[PDB]
Structure formats: structure tokens, C-alpha cells
Amino acid sequence: TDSIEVVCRLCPYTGSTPSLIAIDEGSIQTVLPEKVFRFGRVFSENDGQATVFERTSVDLILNLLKGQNSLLFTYGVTGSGKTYTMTGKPTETGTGLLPRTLDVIFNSINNRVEKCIFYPSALNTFEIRATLDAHLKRHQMAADRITDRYCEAIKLSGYNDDMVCSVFVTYVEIYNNYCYDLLEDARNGVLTKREIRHDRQQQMYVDGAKDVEVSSSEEALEVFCLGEERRRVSSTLLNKDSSRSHSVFTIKLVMAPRAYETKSVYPTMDSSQIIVSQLCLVDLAGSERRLAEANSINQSLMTLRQCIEVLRRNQKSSSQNLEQVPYRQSKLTHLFKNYLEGNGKIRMVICVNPKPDDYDENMSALAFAEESQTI
């Protein structure tokens, strides 16, 4: 089955004294400047972005097309390649998981409709306008609302051509046990704290977070960059590092049965027929991390560790006699309650720096390993 997988990626290191070395392409050995860790896959400095992306994201996108949910974390110290893995630089050798994922999603879906047909509604739902109403909304929206960049050409199969679809993104930040919508229409010049809660389907969501409709990989990246502008607003109004907070970018594939007897591509009007699947990409705060800020980060990452360990034991246990996931011990873990209770697919990418300076911090990062062996 599709249990949680943890993979590890070494960043480039031009030194003679490494704190860890890759062995089996699925194993890593500790090196004092005494433990061996086993992962589902180990990437070396030679493994480029394209290799990571296919091994890390293609099966999650295939999940998305199947109407199932997926969750991907990047974990590690600052300067570990965590942001490089996730986003990188918009070049052929530099682009990370997120833009390639957006590219492949938009390459692989069919029957993508125009905007304002689907639209977000109360309590984490979507409704459906009639076409002429949506048409004016588009021209109402267009009153509101230069990338030379590498683009992934990969097209995956598996989209349900009996479904019509639209793509919505939410971009959310968890900083100091408070949750913020980086896509909020901020009026006061301050981001509003947001509540993490469930809907009637028991699915977690951010109450007042904005679901932004995007028609292309390009448009989705424009929205992502807008969120990055908000993400850089520190408490002291300086530049806040991505290591200081958790960033949650959720790609939603909103689907509905295609309507017959029309020359257009349009859903059936019954909104209860809507199916929504998620691919959620999370760029965790740096594991090395303003005192309450660092305590929230270590509390949340420690809760995450405990939760995936409970998740692993539950995946081997029976229907009864399975143990509670302590997901309420942090805001971050609460937001992914469904995944940590075994719904959907979770993949964690442990980014580690082989430099001997990051030795002790790699010991905590490699503790996420599926299993461990001692010298």
C-alpha cells in the first residue's frame, strides 16, 4: 500500500571531512568529525532536480488525478538545500518540486474550465455558477487581479475525462503557533491570524484562507510569488527567513461530472457532485531553530516526529488496537490530521548537509528514518 515514505537528499559538499556518507542509495552512515539510517531512497549531490522530482512527486500527481490526497514535506537545517529542493531558481537545472509539479499538473489535466464557474463557498466547499453569470464574473474579476522560466513538458495520464476541473491554490504560513494566509487581501497592512478547523467531511482547512483560482502553471506561480512577498514580512518588518516558519502551498483539483448535450466544456450544475483532491507541499521551518519562535518550531517538529511514528505503527496494526495520533500538540500537525491518521499519501524529504558543522543537526534530521542501525 501507499504508506509514508521518507527520502533523504544530500546537498553539494566540497570538503574532505563529511559528517555523513551515502552507501546503498537507500542508506546513510554517520561520521564523527556511529549510526546507519535507512530511507526509501537516498539522493546524492549528483542527483539533479529532474531526478528528485520524478522520484518524489510524480506518484503524488498521479494520486491527485485519481481524486486522492498527497502531502510532501521538506525537512532539514538552514543551508541544507531544503528551499533549493522545493523551489530553487527558475532555470533548467535549478527549478524545484513545486513549479515542476504545477507544470505537470496543468500538462496532465483535461477539461479545465474557464474561471468563476467553480467558486469557493462557505465552510471549505465549492459551488457552480451558470455560464453567462460566470462570464460576467470573469470580466468583473479581470478588472481586479515577466517569467522567462524553465517549464516541465512531462504529461502524465490518469485524468478522468468524464470530469471537468479547475485548479485552486491556497498558500498558508504557520509561524509561532499562529496560522496566516499569505494570499489574504490584506487591508490594514497586517496579516490576520487564521483558525485551523475541520469541515463537515472532517477534513482540515484554514477558516478564512483564500482559495485562488489559477488557469495555468504560470498563473499559479504568480500567486505563489505573491505569497512569498507576504511570507517575508517579519515581526520587526525586516526579512523573515523561510527557516523561521512553515509554508503550506496546497494545490486543489476541483472536479465535477462533465455535462452532456452541450458543445462546451461545463460541469453538471449539481455542486454536491463536486470532488476535490489535494496535493500539499510543505516547506518546514529549519530544525536548528525570538525565544518563543524557536520553542514553537521545535515543539511542532517534535510533534511531527511523534505523529509519523504513531502513523507507522498504525499502518502495521489491526483495525482495532490502533493508537491515537497526538496531532493536537501543535498547529502544524493539527492541519495535517487527516494525513497523519492515514488518509492520503505522505512523503517526507529530509535535506541534510554533509558538512561536519551540521553533524549534530543531521542526527535529529536522520531520526525521521524508517529504521536505524548502530555501529
Numbering used by the authors: 25 to 57, 70 to 181, 188 to 331, 341 to 426
Provide text from the study.
Kinesins are a large family of molecular motor proteins that utilize the energy from ATP hydrolysis to move along microtubules and transport various cellular cargoes. Zen4, MKLP1 (human homologue) and Pavarotti (Drosophila homologue) are kinesin-6 family proteins. They walk to and accumulate at the plus-end of interdigitated microtubules, playing a key role in formation of antiparallel central spindles during cytokinesis in animal cells. The kinesin-6 family proteins have two characteristic features: a long NL and a large insertion in the motor domain.
We crystallized the motor domain of Zen4 (1–441). The final structure was refined to 2.6 Å, with Rwork/Rfree=21%/24%. Interestingly, Zen4 is in the nucleotide-free, apo state. The structure reveals an ion, rather than a nucleotide, is bound by the P-loop (L4 loop). First, the ATPase catalytic site of Zen4 is in an open conformation, with the Switch I region (L9) moving away from the P-loop. Second, the N terminus of Switch II helix (α4) extends two helical turns and moves outward, consistent with enhanced microtubule binding in the apo state. Third, the nucleotide-binding pocket of Zen4 is occluded. In contrast, α6 of Zen4 is partially melted and ends at Phe419 (corresponding to Phe318 in kinesin-1), which is almost one helical turn shorter than the previous structure. The NIS, starting from Glu421, flips backward, forms a five-residue β-strand and becomes disordered after Ile426. The backward flipping of NIS mainly occurs through backbone hydrogen-bond interactions with the N-terminal β1c strand, becoming a part of the N-terminal antiparallel appending β-sheet.
